[PDB]
């Protein structure tokens, strides 16, 4: 089990670790988070008590180095940083643990929620969507725009999601206009799966990452990407059986995990209704349809 120590907590903040969150008071003697399961990506995220504007956070994988949080009173945020000195780090952690100034990643043993939300999410792939190659962790916040949102303003601070556009030359073969627009199988299977993602795992990883960025930072562009990637599969008549079964599981856990009170802003009426009721795959998402109908019958 791994640890993300905090130098301090000089400002009152709600801290998130994956799906868990903790209120920390101004100058409360908090020195970070222990017992973080090895083997998954994690995100540690923040919302200042004094300004709920700017949710922001760090995607990290504890196998890729020793990471700590330190408040920067100049830039006014909790920053992730890498400690290159292994023995200094182990020594810092051992002190804070002995003094029990660290919260425990509170994983229930029966609970596969985080695995199910991050099954295909790969830290080396996150670093290609969020480009800052001098760090092994990735910063995301509420206001970051996607490459696609910028096409229609600072490229350094962009989410480089794969551009999906149903009315693009990329999506539509010359001479197969009606066929490719009404059945997006070509676009899903040849352009996206064989061409760009190479396999269904990479496609699901970006889908899952887009969802998590939407849910944890309320990132609007991530929400658009998550819906687009769902809509491209549901609007394809020909999808491998394994992808359909996996999609149903992926979406089930996303709808299960969503705050009940955020359905109104995070869920797109048109996409869900189309995907569950009209699309080629309207019958292939049993789990997802059951949880959506029972949890958000208003949206439908």
């Amino acid at each position: 089990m791994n640890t993300v120590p905090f130098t301090s907590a000089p400002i009152e903040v709600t801290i998130g670790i994956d799906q868990y969150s903790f209120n920390v008071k101004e100058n409360q003697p908090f020195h970070g988070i222990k017992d973080i399961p090895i083997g998954h990506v994690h995100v540690i995220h923040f919302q200042h008590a004094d300004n709920s504007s700017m949710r922001y956070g760090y995607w990290f994988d504890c196998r890729m180095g020793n990471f700590y949080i330190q408040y920067d009173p100049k830039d006014g945020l909790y920053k992730m940083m890498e400690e290159r000195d292994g023995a200094k780090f182990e020594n810092i952690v051992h002190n804070f643990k002995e003094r029990q100034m660290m919260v425990s990643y509170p994983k229930i043993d029966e609970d596969d929620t985080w695995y199910n939300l991050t099954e295909f999410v790969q830290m080396d792939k996150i670093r290609k969507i969020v480009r800052k190659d001098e760090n092994q962790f990735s910063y995301v916040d509420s206001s970051m725009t996607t490459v696609q949102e910028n096409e229609l303003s600072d490229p350094a601070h962009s989410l480089n999601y794969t551009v999906i556009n149903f009315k693009s030359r990329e999506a539509i073969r010359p001479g197969h206009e009606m066929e490719d627009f009404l059945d997006k199988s070509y676009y899903l299977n040849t352009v996206m799966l064989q061409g760009i993602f190479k396999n269904s795992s990479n496609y699901f990883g970006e889908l899952q990452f887009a969802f998590l960025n939407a849910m944890f930072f309320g990132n609007y562009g991530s929400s658009l990407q998550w819906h687009a990637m769902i809509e491209l599969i549901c609007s394809s008549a020909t999808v491998p059986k394994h992808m359909l079964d996996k999609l149903d599981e992926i979406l089930y856990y996303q709808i299960k995990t969503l705050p009940e009170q955020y359905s109104d802003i995070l869920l797109n009426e048109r996409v869900w209704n189309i995907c569950l009721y009209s699309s080629f795959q309207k019958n292939s998402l049993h789990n997802t349809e059951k949880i959506m109908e029972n949890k958000y019958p208003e949206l439908l």
Partner: protein, 237 residues
């Protein structure tokens, strides 16, 4: 965005534009089969593509053969329309290509947008206007060439005959919409009004009778009366 009452004059500026009406593309008669079930028999259709400034009509005849062994024909008709409009733009020299295409029905936007991806500078626009271009098959010479077609065929017309020699586009288009509105509301009465005087003929190269300026005023009045009469029958007001 959408073409309405407020931005109406734009139709007569010097930016090439075309209206596309797909109403008469897929045409059927519904009939009873021997077993007493219902079946459709398709007849020839047309795409109505009109330059409202010049009166140039690109009448693409849709031969019933295009439907043979096809499913979801009302849907296919919108895509075949978009395919034919795209092929027409591609066939025009660059300086003749429209800068805008206005579709009379919103269901044409996506089919036309997808067929025109090669033309990102051609704006595809809906309209709030209820244009009577559906009545184009009430003009005898247009109906005649469509029903007689034995294969796909493009026929070029000027829907304003020689009117632009005497009046502006704006006025020509208002005359055309009043004629088509009348033909759409009461075809019989409308046609009776146009041919009531045997002395006024239709030139071989024209669609409409050769009315003097004063006879057009009288015709235009009779068409407005027909439209209000028929309105006070529909609604009993």
């Amino acid at each position: 965005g959408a073409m309405n009452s407020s931005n109406y004059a734009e139709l007569f500026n010097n930016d090439i534009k075309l209206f596309v009406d797909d109403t008469n593309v897929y045409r059927v008669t519904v009939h009873k089969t021997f077993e007493g079930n219902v079946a459709t028999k398709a007849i020839n259709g047309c795409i109505f593509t009109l330059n409202p400034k010049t009166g140039h009509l690109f009448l693409k005849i849709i031969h019933t053969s295009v439907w043979a062994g096809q499913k979801r024909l009302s849907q296919l008709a919108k895509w075949k329309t978009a395919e034919e409009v795209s092929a027409l733009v591609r066939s025009l020299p660059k300086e003749e290509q429209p800068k805008q295409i206005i579709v009379t029905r919103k269901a044409m936007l996506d089919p036309l947008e997808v067929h025109m991806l090669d033309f990102p500078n051609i704006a595809i626009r809906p309209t709030e206007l209820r244009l009577p271009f559906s009545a184009a098959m009430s003009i005898d010479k247009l109906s005649d060439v469509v029903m007689k077609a034995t294969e796909p065929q493009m026929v070029l017309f000027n829907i304003y005959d020689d009117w632009l020699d005497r009046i502006s586009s704006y006025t020509a288009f208002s005359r055309l919409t009043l004629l088509l509105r009348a033909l759409k509301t009461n075809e019989e009465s409308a046609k009776m009004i146009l041919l009531s005087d045997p002395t006024i003929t239709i030139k071989s190269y024209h669609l409409w009778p050769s009315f003097t300026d004063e006879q057009w005023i009288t015709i235009e009045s009779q068409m407005r009366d027909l439209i209000l009469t028929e309105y006070g029958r529909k609604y009993n007001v």
